[PDB]
Design a binder for these strands. Structure first.
Ligand code: MN
Ligand code: MN
Ligand code: MN
Length: 184
DNA sequence: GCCTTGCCGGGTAAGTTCCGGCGCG
DNA sequence: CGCGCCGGAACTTAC
DNA sequence: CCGGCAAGGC
């Protein structure tokens, strides 16, 4: 299924960027498995992201709930689910095999999470150079030129800079792509 | 003249893991 | 008994 | 992430 594969890739962009995948161990041989996306904007969390996760949850027949925990500085969308955790973690492991549908959705998600949102410049930040290098190759194959270098010497954070020469192709083909959209 | 992009400090919007519960065969 | 979902938030830093 | 600064390219 390609609409599920794409929405997955997109969610996985948000997760890797602004959340995580947590395998927790508690006292008494108790455990927990968490798919997390955090975000400041209540409306983006509840009106765009959650309906997407909800759709994926239903289609996978995961029957965990979508928790939304309001925190200090940010909303946390959380799904407590061994099945969903491994679904994304295994999907992460085979990121290199992503097809063009998945690549674009992943880059879009990653950008919504980690990207320069003013679009004055086109920039993705991350400590994970290998992840950025994969994104770079995909972008090069989509005819979007880009460079990677160490932006934040204090915290070890790399930036992937998308060349403004390929501005239109990047925004039009990646950011504002109508592909795999909340069907309805 | 103009656009592009490496650089680098500010600080908030993220990320991570702990808690106490309850569920269920 | 042996794990897996809830609901929260303290805590730290990578964007 | 944001955003101002300055080096460099055409
Ligand atoms: Mn991140
Ligand atoms: Mn982030
Ligand atoms: Mn973000």
């Amino acid at each position: 299924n390609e609409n599920v594969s794409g929405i997955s890739a997109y969610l996985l962009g948000l997760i890797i960027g602004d959340g995580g995948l947590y395998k927790l161990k508690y006292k008494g041989n108790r455990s927990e498995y968490r798919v997390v996306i955090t975000q400041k904007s209540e409306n983006l969390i509840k009106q765009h992201i959650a309906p997407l996760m909800q759709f994926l949850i239903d289609e996978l027949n995961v029957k965990s709930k979508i928790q939304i925990v309001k925190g200090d500085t940010r909303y946390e969308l959380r799904v407590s689910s061994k099945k969903l955790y491994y679904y994304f973690a295994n999907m992460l492991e085979r990121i290199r095999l992503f097809n063009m549908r998945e690549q674009i959705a992943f880059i879009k998600g990653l950008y919504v999470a980690e990207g320069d949102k003013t679009l004055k410049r086109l920039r993705i930040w991350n400590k994970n150079k290998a992840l950025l290098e994969i994104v770079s190759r995909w972008l090069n194959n989509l005819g979007v030129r880009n460079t990677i270098h160490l932006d934040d010497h204090r915290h070890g954070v790399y930036v992937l800079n998308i060349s403004l020469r390929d501005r239109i192709k990047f925004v039009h083909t990646i950011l504002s792509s109508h592909l795999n959209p909340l069907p309805p």
